[PDB]
Amino acid sequence: IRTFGWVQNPGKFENLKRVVQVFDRNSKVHNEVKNIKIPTLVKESKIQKELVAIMNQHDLIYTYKELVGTGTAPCDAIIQATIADQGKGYIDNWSSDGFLRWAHALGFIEYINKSDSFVITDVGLAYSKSADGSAIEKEILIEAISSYPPAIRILTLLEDGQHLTKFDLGKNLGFSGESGFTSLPEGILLDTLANAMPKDKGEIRNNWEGSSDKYARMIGGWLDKLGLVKQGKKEFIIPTNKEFISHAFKITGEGLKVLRRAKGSTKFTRVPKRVYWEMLATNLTDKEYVRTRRALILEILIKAGSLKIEQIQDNLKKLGFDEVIETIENDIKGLINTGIFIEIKGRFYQLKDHILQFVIPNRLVKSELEEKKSELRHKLKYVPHEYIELIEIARNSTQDRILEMKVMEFFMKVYGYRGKHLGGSRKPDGAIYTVGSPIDYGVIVDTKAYSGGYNLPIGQADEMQRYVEENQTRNKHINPNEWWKVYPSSVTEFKFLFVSGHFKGNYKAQLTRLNHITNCNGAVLSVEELLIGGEMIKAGTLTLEEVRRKFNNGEINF
């Protein structure tokens, strides 16, 4: 199982070409690589004789392995050897993969499922022989990218002349909210930037980003170099101050022409867009099942006219995929969010685009986590479905940050709390409070993504005791950042909360101890109860004064 259609890390277009010119038997690089680079940088004789040989065939076809190899490292493959490092004389198996994913995404090479192999295409050879810097090579490049949905999607989001950051773009890019397509609330990120030390501002301004923010910056950078978009820093007035984001873009004249024609408002047909099963889901545990489900919905829309979600669900069921209307609706917003045009008029959907033939490989049991996503999408009628994605995100350690921001955002936007997300090693992940309640109270929050079920290690319970007491003592020498100022002075009653995928073990004993030392009440909250409690605030069957009483030094269950 592979994953394509999305690249996260930077590379030179001059290196992309070389990667392509290797599948073309009559190019210089092909010979240069197989006749010089490989026998030189590839020591282990056996693989060395196997690779040049493979590059020696008449009709060239390379398997994933032959191109990417393995890493830890020595030269293990073709791509590795045709591209030198940014200093070895070759690149690793990670950067090799980005380049493979990149060549494939723009359509210069095609993937043959089941054979786990690639070959050059029609436009790839033309790209290969194209003169460097010529007007024709540029032409080939712009046509290639126009068959790439995400690029078309980035262009659609800037069509009105808007000036947006990678975050404002990322939130409406791909299958938004789920793992692999996450975006950091801009407003929340600028806050961390405004109160940061000038020595860390740069890293936060450019390396603090969600998956979709990554893709938006990359795709946006591709379009910039081709003249379809213009990258320029966006500025903001953030009072603790002034801040700016350099990864911002704005459409151009040549970009609107490309979009106009891609929409179908021109005298020429649009460029047929390439879509593959491997692009309909990335870092999702159940990506094999989900990829198929979204693939089959695309198909139905394709061979059909105007349809009602119930008919789509109906057509889907015939294929053996028992889905609920809102899962199908979320799957469609993602298709739209990746570059495909599907008009929605009232209760009817109708695809209006030109997509080519893609193969659904091996044509699968729904996992317990997806069934839970399905249950909550068809149950929580007020909760923006995107939040239900936190149930899976909360089980991945690598996702603390987005978990951080997204949980605080839900508190303020859905529950109705005031306050904000803090984060860092000296501040709690968030500090929220109420206004106008019978008893206005404050809350100290800490979140944590963990796989399996948090038992609340004494280490994290240790870090929370520090926040609760610092809000009691409030000494500027102990903590010069006086974070507690976030709270209104009138507030005197505080609570502490730990939020995670789900809890198990003797977490209660930790709560009993912290309550005894600080005298404050606290609790633990599973992400699913966070959502359940937020849909109640909205349904009207739960109040912020009822939450107050939930802190009983145990687990909260609404």
Burial, 74: exposed, middle or buried (Cβ in 10 Å; 0-12, 13-18, 19+)?
A: middle
Q: How many other C-beta atoms are found inside a 10 Å radius of the C-beta of residue 233?
A: 13
Which regions of the chain carry the CATH code 3.90.241.10?
A: 1-276
> What's the CA gap between 426 and 200, in Å, rounded?
15
H or E stretch at 510: helix 507-518
In three-state secondary structure terms, 126 is helix
Q: What angle do CA 95, 11, 51 make, to 5 degrees?
A: 45
Residue 271 DSSP label: P
Which amino acid, residue 312? I
H or E stretch at 294: helix 287-303
> What's the CA gap between 290 and 308, in Å, rounded?
21
Strands (DSSP E) contained in 259-408 are 307-308, 342-345, 348-351
H or E stretch at 420: strand 418-421
> What's the CA gap between 369 and 22, in Å, rounded?
42
> What's the CA gap between 40 and 281, in Å, rounded?
39
Following CA atoms 506, 510, 516, 519 in sequence, which dihedral angle do they give, to the nearest 10 degrees?
-120
Strands (DSSP E) contained in 31-172 are 62-63, 109-112, 117-120, 164-165
β-bridge pairing 418-421 and 430-433: antiparallel
Residue 306 DSSP label: S
> What's the CA gap between 165 and 383, in Å, rounded?
26
Which regions of the chain carry the CATH code 3.40.91.30?
A: 380-554
> What's the CA gap between 300 and 307, in Å, rounded?
9
Positions marked active-site: 429, 446, 448
List the one residue out of 338, 320, 124 whose CA is nearest residue 211. 338
Q: What is the DSSP string of 514-554?
A: HHHHH--EEEEEEHHHHHHHHHHHHHTS--HHHHHTT-SSE
Q: Which fold has domain 380-554?
A: Restriction Endonuclease (3.40.91)
In three-state secondary structure terms, 237 is strand
List the one residue out of 65, 68, 70, 71 whose CA is nearest residue 82. 68
Contact (CB, 8 A) for 233 and 193: no
Task: Specify which residues 491 forms β-bridges with.
Answer: none
Which regions of the chain carry the CATH code 1.10.10.10?
A: 286-367
Q: Is the dihedral of CA 159, 235, 13, 207 positive or negative?
A: negative
CATH of 1-276 among 3.30.365.10, 3.60.20.10, 3.90.241.10, 3.40.50.11030: 3.90.241.10
Q: Tell the residue number behind the tokens 């993969």, with chain if given.
A: 97
Contact (CB, 8 A) for 188 and 209: no
Which amino acid, residue 250? K
Q: Which fold has domain 286-367?
A: Arc Repressor Mutant, subunit A (1.10.10)
> What's the CA gap between 518 and 496, in Å, rounded?
10
Contact (CB, 8 A) for 377 and 388: yes
Structure tokens at 394: 């909360």
Task: Specify which residues 62 forms β-bridges with.
Answer: 118
* C-alpha distance across the termini of the chain, in Å: 40
H or E stretch at 400: helix 400-410
List the one residue out of 513, 514, 522, 519 whose CA is nearest residue 553. 522
> What's the CA gap between 256 and 158, in Å, rounded?
9
Experimental method: X-ray
> What's the CA gap between 228 and 224, in Å, rounded?
6
Q: What angle do CA 412, 413, 414 make, to 5 degrees?
A: 100
Question: How many residues in total does the chain contain?
Answer: 558
List alpha helices for 106-240, DSSP H: 122-129, 135-146, 149-157, 166-170, 186-194, 198-207, 211-225
Distance of CA 396 to the CA centre of its chain: 13
Which amino acid, residue 493? E
Contact (CB, 8 A) for 69 and 42: no
Structure tokens at 31: 């010979």
Distance of CA 370 to the CA centre of its chain: 18
Q: Tell the residue number behind the tokens 């929580």, with chain if given.
A: 380
List the one residue out of 22, 85, 28, 82 whose CA is nearest residue 57. 22
List the one residue out of 403, 402, 393 whose CA is nearest residue 285. 393
List the one residue out of 272, 253, 271 whose CA is nearest residue 261. 271
Residues 6+ apart with CB under 8 A from 212: 169, 170, 171, 173, 174, 176, 181, 182, 183
Cα within 13 Å of Cα(12), Cβ side? 7
Q: How many other C-beta atoms are found inside a 10 Å radius of the C-beta of residue 540?
A: 8
Contact (CB, 8 A) for 292 and 360: yes
H or E stretch at 119: strand 117-120
Task: Specify which residues 495 forms β-bridges with.
Answer: 443, 521
Quote the crossing angle between the two packed helices 400-410 and 186-194, to the nearest 10°.
Answer: 110
- φ, ψ (nearest 5 deg) of residue 77: -165, 180
Longest Cα–Cα distance of the chain, Å, equals 81
Cα-only R_g, the chain = 26
β-bridge pairing 494-500 and 442-448: parallel
> What's the CA gap between 315 and 353, in Å, rounded?
20
Task: Specify which residues 244 forms β-bridges with.
Answer: 235
Contact (CB, 8 A) for 131 and 137: yes
Burial, 529: exposed, middle or buried (Cβ in 10 Å; 0-12, 13-18, 19+)?
A: middle
Contact (CB, 8 A) for 384 and 535: no
> What's the CA gap between 364 and 289, in Å, rounded?
6
Which amino acid, residue 416? G
H or E stretch at 461: helix 458-473
